[PDB]
Amino acid sequence: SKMNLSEEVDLEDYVARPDKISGADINSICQESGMLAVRENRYIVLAKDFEKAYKTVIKKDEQEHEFY
Amino acid sequence: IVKMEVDYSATVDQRLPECAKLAKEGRLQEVIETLLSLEKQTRTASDMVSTSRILVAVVKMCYEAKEWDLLNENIMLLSKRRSQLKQAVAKMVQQCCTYVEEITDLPIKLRLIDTLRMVTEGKIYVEIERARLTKTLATIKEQNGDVKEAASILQELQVETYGSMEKKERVEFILEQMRLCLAVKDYIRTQIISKKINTKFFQEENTEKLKLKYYNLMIQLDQHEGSYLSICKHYRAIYDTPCIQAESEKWQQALKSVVLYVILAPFDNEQSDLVHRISGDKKLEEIPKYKDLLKLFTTMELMRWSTLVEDYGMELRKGSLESPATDVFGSTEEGEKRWKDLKNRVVEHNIRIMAKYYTRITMKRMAQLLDLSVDESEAFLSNLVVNKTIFAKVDRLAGIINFQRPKDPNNLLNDWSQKLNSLMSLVNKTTHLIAKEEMIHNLQ
Amino acid sequence: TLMELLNQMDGFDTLHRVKMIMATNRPDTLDPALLRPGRLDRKIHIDLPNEQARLDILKIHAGPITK
Amino acid sequence: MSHEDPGNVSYSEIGGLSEQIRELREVIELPLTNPELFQRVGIIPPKGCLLYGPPGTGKTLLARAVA
Amino acid sequence: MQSGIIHAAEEKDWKTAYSYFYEAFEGYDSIDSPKAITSLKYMLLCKIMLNTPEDVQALVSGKLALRYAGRQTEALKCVAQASKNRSLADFEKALTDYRAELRDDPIISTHLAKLYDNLLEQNLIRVIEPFSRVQIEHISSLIKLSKADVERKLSQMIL
Numbered sequence: 161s162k163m164n165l166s167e168e169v170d171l172e173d174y175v176a177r178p179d180k181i182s183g184a185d186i187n188s189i190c191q192e193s194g195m196l197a198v199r200e201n202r203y204i205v206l207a208k209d210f211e212k213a214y215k216t217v218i219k220k221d222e223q224e225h226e227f228y
Numbered sequence: 229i230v231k232m233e234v235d236y237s238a239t240v241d242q243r244l245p246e247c248a249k250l251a252k253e254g255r256l257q258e259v260i261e262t263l264l265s266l267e268k269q270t271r272t273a274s275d276m277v278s279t280s281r282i283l284v285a286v287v288k289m290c291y292e293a294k295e296w297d298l299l300n301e302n303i304m305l306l307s308k309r310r311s312q313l314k315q316a317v318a319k320m321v322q323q324c325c326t327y328v329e330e331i332t333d334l335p336i337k338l339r340l341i342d343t344l345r346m347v348t349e350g351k352i353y354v355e356i357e358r359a360r361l362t363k364t365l366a367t368i369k370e371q372n373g374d375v376k377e378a379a380s381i382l383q384e385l386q387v388e389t390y391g392s393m394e395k396k397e398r399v400e401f402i403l404e405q406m407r408l409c410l411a412v413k414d415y416i417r418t419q420i421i422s423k424k425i426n427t428k429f430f431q432e433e434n435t436e437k438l439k440l441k442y443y444n445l446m447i448q449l450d451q452h453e454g455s456y457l458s459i460c461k462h463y464r465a466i467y468d469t470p471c472i473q474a475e476s477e478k479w480q481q482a483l484k485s486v487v488l489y490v491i492l493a494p495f496d497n498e499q500s501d502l503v504h505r506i507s508g509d510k511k512l513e514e515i516p517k518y519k520d521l522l523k524l525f526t527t528m529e530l531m532r533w534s535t536l537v538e539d540y541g542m543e544l545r546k547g548s549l550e551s552p553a554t555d556v557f558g559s560t561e562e563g564e565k566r567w568k569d570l571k572n573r574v575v576e577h578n579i580r581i582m583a584k585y586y587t588r589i590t591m592k593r594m595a596q597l598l599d600l601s602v603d604e605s606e607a608f609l610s611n612l613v614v615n616k617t618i619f620a621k622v623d624r625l626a627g628i629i630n631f632q633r634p635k636d637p638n639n640l641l642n643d644w645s646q647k648l649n650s651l652m653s654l655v656n657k658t659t660h661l662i663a664k665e666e667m668i669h670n671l672q
Numbered sequence: 673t674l675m676e677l678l679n680q681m682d683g684f685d686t687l688h689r690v691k692m693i694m695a696t697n698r699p700d701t702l703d704p705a706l707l708r709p710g711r712l713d714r715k716i717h718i719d720l721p722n723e724q725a726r727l728d729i730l731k732i733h734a735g736p737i738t739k
Numbered sequence: 740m741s742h743e744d745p746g747n748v749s750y751s752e753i754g755g756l757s758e759q760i761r762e763l764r765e766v767i768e769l770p771l772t773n774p775e776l777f778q779r780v781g782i783i784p785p786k787g788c789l790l791y792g793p794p795g796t797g798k799t800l801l802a803r804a805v806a
Numbered sequence: 807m808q809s810g811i812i813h814a815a816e817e818k819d820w821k822t823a824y825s826y827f828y829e830a831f832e833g834y835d836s837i838d839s840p841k842a843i844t845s846l847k848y849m850l851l852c853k854i855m856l857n858t859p860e861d862v863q864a865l866v867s868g869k870l871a872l873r874y875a876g877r878q879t880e881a882l883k884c885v886a887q888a889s890k891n892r893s894l895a896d897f898e899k900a901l902t903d904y905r906a907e908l909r910d911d912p913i914i915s916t917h918l919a920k921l922y923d924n925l926l927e928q929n930l931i932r933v934i935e936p937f938s939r940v941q942i943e944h945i946s947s948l949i950k951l952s953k954a955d956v957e958r959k960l961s962q963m964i965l
């Protein structure tokens with residue numbers, strides 16, 4: 161929201177998936193991810209624009225199912 | 229891509245021509261199916277040359293038996309079966325490109341778009357893109373120039389231009405689409421494509437009819453809305469081309485256009501640099517535009533356009549060639565717009581030169597000098613000051629103006645002191661000069 | 673030294689038109705702080721030469737050979 | 740030691756790494772030749788790329804070729 | 807919506823109010839009609855307050871804007887096109903054409919009045935550089951207004 165809705169982001173981008181992580185990703189990385197979600201070979205911020213920076217930085221530490 | 233497993237060169241050699249004879253007029257589709265099975269066998273064996281030959285044979289059979297519809301779904305099935313071998317499909321499109329260009333027909337437009345749909349699935353920069361460019365250019369020629377296909381060729385060029393271009397073929401393709409874009413009379417997109425391609429220069433040193441053609445299509449684009457400085461810059465960029473190819477008519481008319489444009493451009497420091505650089509040209513003297521440029525460039529003359537339309541306005545009626553002049557001012561609608569653009573351009577020029585000469589000028593005289601009334605003169609005077617071009621203050625009730633900034637007493641006494649020191653230095657220099665000349669003059 | 677290198681290449685002030693190309697032999701022993709995206713944008717593994725690639729290299733190496 | 744690069748051969752003299760060659764082109768040449776496209780994109784160019792693998796790949800040849 | 811309301815009243819920056827208003831309207835997507843109408847009205851009011859009415863046409867042409875289109879929405883579009891023309895009279899005409907639709911004191915009448923003052927100040931300042939001394943009824947003629955209101959505005963600026 162600082163960069164106003166990620167500079168006019170699309171609806172189908174919600175942070176439900178890339179944040180329920182349990183993979184640290186400190187606020188500095190969060191700000192970097194916000195500023196790196198910027199591949200825009202077109203007009204506006206979209207989903208395909210994201211997926212380059214949205215599939216990049218994938219979340220390694222996992223396996224909470226054994227604990228739950 | 230992948231290593232060949234089982235070759236069938238002997239099988240295709242002994243069977244394909246026999247299959248062609250068995251289906252000379254193409255009435256049999258079992259022959260098509262059995263070669264599909266054969267090329268599938270070679271495809272599973274990862275052989276490229278055999279599959280390519282089969283596809284070339286299949287389309288060749290469709291050419292000779294002229295089944296246009298069955299060709300459409302046949303090539304659709306071939307390109308969509310499993311995508312086969314990229315070398316083979318790239319080949320098959322190439323002979324399809326070679327064939328669609330020789331038969332005019334009505335549904336070749338359907339053939340062109342069908343292959344376009346087959347190649348637009350991706351794999352553009354990789355595995356042949358010049359075919360798609362040729363098909364789009366072929367579509368342009370078939371529809372004889374419209375807006376839909378001009379948009380299509382607009383949205384196609386970018387991928388291949390960035391990926392794999394040609395110093396002649398690609399730029400001509402760019403030149404052949406911007407003219408259609410200008411024919412559509414779209415200005416924002418045509419400006420965008422022109423400015424994104426003109427960054428690729430340093431090939432024009434060997435141009436024949438390419439840089440001039442590019443420029444002569446972007447002359448109309450710029451001058452359509454408001455451009456007058458870029459107009460003179462690329463009209464002199466087409467003036468230096470007859471320097472290496474000396475042809476008199478185009479050369480002289482280019483000189484007439486650039487001289488008229490460079491003066492007509494709004495006043496700025498850069499325009500002053502161009503007019504001074506243009507002036508003094510040895511080859512520019514033999515045209516009446518030489519007298520026009522010499523008069524209207526410097527020495528702050530009263531540019532009464534009512535007098536100029538007959539003193540130097542002969543280019544409108546009759547000159548040496550008068551072909552650019554008739555294009556500029558001899559036109560009816562756009563010509564009268566440029567006539568008004570000359571009418572005002574000399575008004576700001578007259579205001580500007582009056583600014584550096586006259587401090588306070590009465591309203592009647594200034595309006596008479598501007599060839600307008602009081603309200604029109606004050607309206608343009610307001611137009612200059614809002615642009616910060618001139619330092620003007622007017623008393624509207626009194627109708628009197630001033631151009632000198634109020635001198636602050638600090639710097640007022642400073643220039644007085646500088647004037648004093650200049651006098652003091654002059655006393656020192658004169659005293660040394662006269663005393664020494666006194667010494668020489670009394671050596672007797 | 674590693675911390676100074678990290679805070680001078682990423683740090684607070686970034687570089688402009690400057691690209692770093694680096695190579696090594698043990699990717700696992702590398703510090704995870706350096707290899708995070710933002711400092712190393714792309715990771716490329718140069719694999720074993722292909723059999724036809726080896727053929728081309730052999731031809732290149734056997735160019736000026738009397739045979 | 741950074742201005743004494745020995746006379747090398749062209750980067751086209753090593754085969755099987757054309758993908759790595761175009762990776763080097765679109766990380767070095769592209770950002771500086773055409774900033775207008777990326778301006779329409781509105782993004783910063785990437786910073787660096789990593790090469791790793793068996794000790795014999797051609798990394799020194801590629802580094803010397805680009806040098 | 808409230809955060810955008812507070813930021814809009816703070817007036818230091820309006821672009822962040824645009825983000826908050828859009829998020830509120832995004833939360834009100836065909837769920838609560840009166841709250842959605844207020845959110846989009848506030849969203850477009852701060853958008854025109856950013857002095858960029860060019861994006862208004864795209865914003866009002868959006869699918870959600872057309873879904874929640876109304877007389878108040880059209881009035882704001884007319885206000886935006888008045889800002890395009892830089893005509894304080896056109897803004898005043900649009901306000902009178904839809905008065906009860908935009909008579910709301912909270913961040914509706916206040917901001918429209920503030921914007922109206924901005925155009926008045928900008929129009930006066932734009933036409934005042936040439937004149938060292940100009941008669942004020944001529945100034946009223948250029949601005950296309952009466953004499954008392956122009957004199958009152960020019961005074962309040964100079965006091």
Ligand SMILES: Nc1ncnc2c1ncn2[C@@H]1O[C@H](COP(=O)(O)OP(=O)(O)O)[C@@H](O)[C@H]1O
Pocket residue numbers: 721729732752753754755793794795796797798799800801
């Ligand atoms: N792909 C290749 N093409 C041609 N020559 C190669 C290749 N890979 C290695 N070489 C040979 O290896 C030597 C270069 O060493 P190199 O493998 O580049 O070191 P490193 O892998 O540590 O960068 C040269 O003599 C060169 O002939």
